[PDB]
Structures are given as C-alpha cells and as structure tokens.
Write a protein that binds this ligand. Structure first.
Ligand SMILES: COc1cccc([C@@H](C)NC(=O)c2ccc(-c3ccncc3)cc2NCCN)c1
Lengths: 333, 18
C-alpha cells in the first residue's frame, strides 16, 4: 500500500496543479475562523450549490513576517497527498492581493470545542481518535513529511464521527534534520526548545501530549506564560491522574520520553512499537482505516451550510487591488 | 485540584502557533 502511495505522491510533488478555479465562482457566506495572515470562510460554489471552506492569505502580510517558504510548502504538500483522515484540497488559485485554498467543508467543527465542553474523553473514546493519528503519521512519515502542529484545534470531526487533519502551515518534506522554532507551546518536544536539530520523532512526542489532554481534560505541561511551559517540558517530570489505567501510563511514559534512543516511534521497530502496545490490544487497525468501527460521537447535523458547531467572528470586506502584489515571490503557487 | 488550576489559568481557549 505504502509503495503505491509514494508513486502517486511523487508524481504530484514534481508537477503541482495550479490555478484550478476563480474567486467569482463562489458566494462568501460567513467566517469560520481566523489566522495570522487571513481567515477561513464558508463558501458556496454557485453553479453546483456545493459548500466548501476557503482559506484566504494576504500576500503582503506573508512577506512581512518572512513566511514565504512555509506558505509554498503548505500548498505543494496538500495538493499531492491522499488519505482518509486528511482534509482534501479541491481547488487553489491567486489574484493581485491574495492566495486561496478551497477545501472540503467539515461541519462537525474542531475536536477542541467538544473536548472543552464535555471536559474529558473516556479511554475507549481517546483510543479511537489516537488510532487515526497513528495511521496518518505512518502515511505522512513514509513520504518524508513532518507535520509539526498536532493539537485538538487542528482535528475536525466529520459526519461519520471520524477525524480530518487540517492546517499544513508548518508541514515540510525533509530527509534528516531541521531547525525551525515552530509549533504550539504545550505540544513542543524538548529538542525543539533546546535549539537542537530535530526529526520525525517530534510528531510522536506531540501524540503523547494529545492522548494525555484527551483522557485528562488538561495538558501534561500548562502555565500562564510560554516560558513557564518550556521549563516544565525540559524537566522531564510528568504526573498522571488516578483514573488513568496502568497500560495508558506506560504508553505515555514511552511517548513523552526525553531520550531519543528510547522514545516510541523512534526505535528499530518504528511505528510497530506503538501499534503492538497493551493499550491498543482491542484496536482493529484495518477496520479503523476502512471506517468500519462505530464512532463514539456523531455531531448534530442541521442541514447543508450550517455553522452552529463553529464560533462567531467579525466579518470584513475582501479587498483585491488593481496592481499585482508579490508576483515573483509566489510564482509557483 | 489540577483541573481547577487549569480552568483558572489564561490558556483554556484556542492556542495560536508561536
Ligand atoms: C497563518 O495565517 C492563517 C490564515 C488563515 C487560517 C489559518 C489557520 C489558523 N487555519 C487553518 O489552516 C484552517 C484551515 C481550514 C480549516 C477548516 C475548517 C472547516 N472545514 C475545513 C477546514 C480549519 C483551520 N484551522 C482550525 C483551527 N483554527 C492561518
């Protein structure tokens, strides 16, 4: 399966698709969320009635914050990948002022919203989601891709109750070591904080942080300021709630491992050390990939184009200049 | 409790990238 997946990825990686739609083909309905250089909006393809999520980026803001390379990485990778637990890019284009990425709309909202509301997920609920991430990372790492931004905020729940990973802003194709200080404070591996060279093992540490937060209701390392969070991460010490099972505590000690020669996912057997662990004994790995396992939660469906599972944001008029901005910089987009 | 300390902290909302 992985050998055939690589052939498909490399063909698109070498010759990326460009300019597959235009802004005037879509009706802008409402803002679903915001980011550093723009926003995500619910749109409708007027001639079909199909709904989508459109990510809009201001070219001038990207250049100002020196994020050109990361923005090009995000689009090049997303147009080349194909997996059930990854959000699909339908169209991409640009104009004088902005960059546009049109993705499949996920109406169930972010895992973040549901997790904070109910407090914490049960161990079988946490297991179902964790299994989907394990398979997604197995797929991504095999293509020499590093994700670098795992958190409940980036995990969308579809109408089948399955996960769809979004935001490839820090995704990169790398063989060997990389050095960029990027990610979310609570999810940073100690090797990132200590300005060392790092590899794919940072995604396996992030999985440890995610499983802990899902089962406890709070992260393993928290404070009011990022500097205090970093102090707790580098110390090595982790305390587990009394309700955590014996098998869950053992897996987390192996994922939240400071020593790279001992961290699960980074050993001789690779991903198999995680997949064969006692906590995953009941997991049917093939049935998860095939979407045959019953989901613990199915989000309430209120028709097409409904935004009830998302928070409200202040609207703003999208401006397109009569003069081309940053033409050479984004030539390959 | 650790839960009470988390809910009283300033980082319970959506977390942005560094
Ligand atoms: C740096 O400048 C940026 C400018 C604008 C957005 C962003 C980042 C923060 N947001 C995303 O990449 C993003 C994209 C699509 C969807 C989505 C929603 C619903 N159905 C499908 C897909 C969800 C997202 N984030 C969800 C957590 N907030 C950064």
């Amino acid at each position: 399966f992985l050998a055939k997946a690589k052939e498909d990825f490399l063909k698109k990686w070498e010759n990326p698709a460009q300019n597959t739609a235009h802004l005037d083909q879509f009706e802008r309905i409402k803002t679903l969320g915001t980011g550093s250089f723009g926003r995500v909006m619910l749109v409708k393809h007027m001639e079909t009635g199909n709904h989508y999520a459109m990510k809009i980026l201001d070219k001038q803001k990207v250049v100002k914050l020196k994020q050109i390379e990361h923005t090009l990485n995000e689009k090049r990778i997303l147009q080349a990948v194909n997996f059930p637990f990854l959000v699909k890019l339908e169209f991409s284009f640009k104009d004088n002022s902005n960059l546009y990425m049109v993705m499949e709309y996920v109406p169930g909202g972010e895992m973040f919203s549901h997790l904070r509301r109910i407090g914490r997920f049960s161990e079988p609920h946490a297991r179902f989601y964790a299994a989907q991430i394990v398979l997604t990372f197995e797929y991504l790492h095999s293509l020499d891709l590093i994700y670098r931004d795992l958190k409940p905020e980036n995990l969308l729940i579809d109408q089948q109750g399955y996960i769809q990973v979004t935001d490839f802003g820090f995704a990169k194709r790398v063989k060997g070591r990389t050095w960029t200080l990027c990610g979310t404070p609570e999810y940073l591996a100690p090797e990132i904080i200590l300005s060392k060279g790092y590899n794919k093992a940072v995604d396996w540490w992030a999985l440890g942080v995610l499983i802990y937060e899902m089962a406890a209701g709070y992260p393993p390392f928290f404070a009011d300021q990022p500097i205090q969070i970093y102090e707790k991460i580098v110390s090595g010490k982790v305390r587990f709630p009394s309700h955590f099972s014996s098998d869950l505590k053992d897996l987390l000690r192996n994922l939240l491992q400071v020593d790279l020669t001992k961290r699960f996912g980074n050993l001789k057997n690779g991903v198999n050390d995680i997949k064969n662990h006692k906590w995953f004994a009941t997991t049917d790995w093939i049935a998860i990939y095939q979407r045959k396992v019953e989901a613990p939660f199915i989000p309430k469906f209120k028709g097409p184009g409904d935004t009830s599972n998302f928070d409200d944001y202040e609207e703003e008029e999208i401006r397109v200049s009569i003069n081309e901005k940053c033409g050479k910089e984004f030539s390959e987009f | 409790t650790t839960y009470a300390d988390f809910i009283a902290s300033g980082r319970t909302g959506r977390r942005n990238a560094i």
